[PDB]
């Protein structure tokens, strides 16, 4: 899966 | 009408209430505040932290326009405004920039494909609503909280009295009720 | 020369301040 804004916000 | 630490804390307390209350209609104001902070103090937070939050705010603005039923012409205008073609930190790395640019493109193409009214548009809108719903918003609020904690570290000792002082200058001769958003900001920031 | 002095000298746009002060009250 390519990065989404959603997952980028949710990660770390 | 003021400047200095008081002005920053006024916009921070307002922005903190906007995000906690999920007031998407004021998310553009939070973006201008963060963009003003980044222009003067890029060292407050890491670039990845700043851009994760700003993109989350931008995406929610676009998603909200979609979910409220705005015409696609207006959705796409806001999309291209907040996510334009073009185009900075001592550790503004390439791996973080890769992921940031990649997240923008997938969201842009996602909205563009929705605007073409695919046969399964209704299913995709419920997925979009989940994708940018409560858990996404809670993580976003957490990013803003840490951003504002870094702002408070760079400011002198707060003084809870400035807001009432400033509002009395703007609105002389009338009773100003104490701001709950202002007090909640002071509680969350750990003011004495 | 420091981050604290740089932050405390910040000047935000007038319309952002107008929105913020009215929003708080």
From Swiss-Prot, chain A:
> Can you tell which superkingdom this protein's organism belongs to?
Eukaryota
- Please outline how this chain is modified post-translation: Phosphorylated upon DNA damage, most probably by ATM. Phosphorylated TERF2 is not bound to telomeric DNA, and rapidly localizes to damage sites. Methylated by PRMT1 at multiple arginines within the N-terminal Arg-rich region. Methylation may control association with telomeres.
Found in which tissues? Ubiquitous. Highly expressed in spleen, thymus, prostate, uterus, testis, small intestine, colon and peripheral blood leukocytes.
Compartments reported by the entry: Nucleus; Chromosome, Telomere
Q: What does this protein do?
A: Binds the telomeric double-stranded 5'-TTAGGG-3' repeat and plays a central role in telomere maintenance and protection against end-to-end fusion of chromosomes. In addition to its telomeric DNA-binding role, required to recruit a number of factors and enzymes required for telomere protection, including the shelterin complex, TERF2IP/RAP1 and DCLRE1B/Apollo. Component of the shelterin complex (telosome) that is involved in the regulation of telomere length and protection.
Show the domain comment.
The TRFH dimerization region mediates the interaction with DCLRE1B/Apollo but not TINF2.
Task: State whether it acts alone or in a complex, and with which partners, per the record.
Answer: Homodimer. Component of the shelterin complex (telosome) composed of TERF1, TERF2, TINF2, TERF2IP/RAP1, ACD and POT1. Interacts with NBN; interaction takes place with unphosphorylated NBN during G1 phase and prevents to prevent ATM activation and non-homologous end joining repair. Interacts with SLX4/BTBD12. Interacts with DCLRE1B/Apollo and TERF2IP/RAP1; the interaction is direct.
What is the protein's given name? Telomeric repeat-binding factor 2
Q: Which organism is it from?
A: Homo sapiens
From Swiss-Prot, chain B:
Subcellular localization, as worded in the UniProt entry: Nucleus; Chromosome, Telomere
Q: Which domain of life is it from?
A: Eukaryota
The record's account of tissue expression is: Detected in heart, brain, placenta, lung, liver, skeletal muscle, kidney and pancreas.
Q: What is known of its domains?
A: The TBM domain mediates interaction with TERF1.
The task this protein performs is described as: Component of the shelterin complex (telosome) that is involved in the regulation of telomere length and protection. Shelterin associates with arrays of double-stranded TTAGGG repeats added by telomerase and protects chromosome ends; without its protective activity, telomeres are no longer hidden from the DNA damage surveillance and chromosome ends are inappropriately processed by DNA repair pathways. Plays a role in shelterin complex assembly. Isoform 1 may have additional role in tethering telomeres to the nuclear matrix.
State whether it acts alone or in a complex, and with which partners, per the record.
Answer: Monomer. Found in a complex with POT1; TERF1 and TNKS1. Component of the shelterin complex (telosome) composed of TERF1, TERF2, TINF2, TERF2IP ACD and POT1. Interacts with TERF1, TERF2 and ACD.
Disease implicated: Dyskeratosis congenita, autosomal dominant, 3: A rare multisystem disorder caused by defective telomere maintenance. It is characterized by progressive bone marrow failure, and the clinical triad of reticulated skin hyperpigmentation, nail dystrophy, and mucosal leukoplakia. Common but variable features include premature graying, aplastic anemia, low platelets, osteoporosis, pulmonary fibrosis, and liver fibrosis among others. Early mortality is often associated with bone marrow failure, infections, fatal pulmonary complications, or malignancy.
**What's the protein called, per UniProt?**
TERF1-interacting nuclear factor 2
Q: What is the species listed in this Swiss-Prot or TrEMBL entry?
A: Homo sapiens
What part of the full protein is here?
Answer: 5 to 199 of 451
From Swiss-Prot, chain C:
Disulfide bond residue pairs: none
User: Where in or outside the cell is it found?
Assistant: Nucleus; Chromosome, Telomere
Q: Which domain of life is it from?
A: Eukaryota
Record function comment: Component of the shelterin complex (telosome) that is involved in the regulation of telomere length and protection. Shelterin associates with arrays of double-stranded TTAGGG repeats added by telomerase and protects chromosome ends. Without its protective activity, telomeres are no longer hidden from the DNA damage surveillance and chromosome ends are inappropriately processed by DNA repair pathways. Promotes binding of POT1 to single-stranded telomeric DNA. Modulates the inhibitory effects of POT1 on telomere elongation.
Disease note: Dyskeratosis congenita, autosomal dominant, 6: A form of dyskeratosis congenita, a rare multisystem disorder caused by defective telomere maintenance. It is characterized by progressive bone marrow failure, and the clinical triad of reticulated skin hyperpigmentation, nail dystrophy, and mucosal leukoplakia. Common but variable features include premature graying, aplastic anemia, low platelets, osteoporosis, pulmonary fibrosis, and liver fibrosis among others. Early mortality is often associated with bone marrow failure, infections, fatal pulmonary complications, or malignancy.
Q: How does it assemble?
A: Component of the shelterin complex (telosome) composed of TERF1, TERF2, TINF2, TERF2IP ACD and POT1. Forms heterodimers with POT1. Identified in a complex with POT1 and single-stranded telomeric DNA. Interacts with STN1 and TINF2.
Q: Mind telling me what this protein is named?
A: Adrenocortical dysplasia protein homolog
| Annotated source species | Homo sapiens (Human)
Coverage of the whole protein, first to last residue?
424 to 447 of 458
């Amino acid at each position: 899966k390519r990065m989404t804004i959603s997952r980028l916000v949710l990660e770390e | 009408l003021v400047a200095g630490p008081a002005a920053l804390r006024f916009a921070a307390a307002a922005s903190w209430q906007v995000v906690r209350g999920r007031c998407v209609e004021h998310f553009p104001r939070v973006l201008e505040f963060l963009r003003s902070l980044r222009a003067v103090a890029p060292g407050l937070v890491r670039y990845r932290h700043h851009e994760r939050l700003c993109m989350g705010l931008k995406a929610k603005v676009v998603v909200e326009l979609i979910l409220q039923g705005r015409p696609w012409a207006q959705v796409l205008k806001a999309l291209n405004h907040h996510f334009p073609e073009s185009g900075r930190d001592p550790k503004a790395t390439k791996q973080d920039l890769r992921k940031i640019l990649e997240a923008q493109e997938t969201f842009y193409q996602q909205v563009k494909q929705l605007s073409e009214a695919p046969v399964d548009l209704a299913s995709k809108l419920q997925e979009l609503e989940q994708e940018y719903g409560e858990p996404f918003l809670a993580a976003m609020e957490k990013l803003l909280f840490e951003y504002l904690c870094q702002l408070e570290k760079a400011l002198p000792t707060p003084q809870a009295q400035q807001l009432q002082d400033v509002l009395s200058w703007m609105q002389p001769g009338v009773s100003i009720t104490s701001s709950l958003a202002w007090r909640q900001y002071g509680v969350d920031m750990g003011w004495l | 020369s420091s981050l604290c002095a740089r932050v405390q000298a910040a000047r935000l746009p007038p319309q952002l301040m107008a929105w913020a002060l009215h929003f708080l009250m």
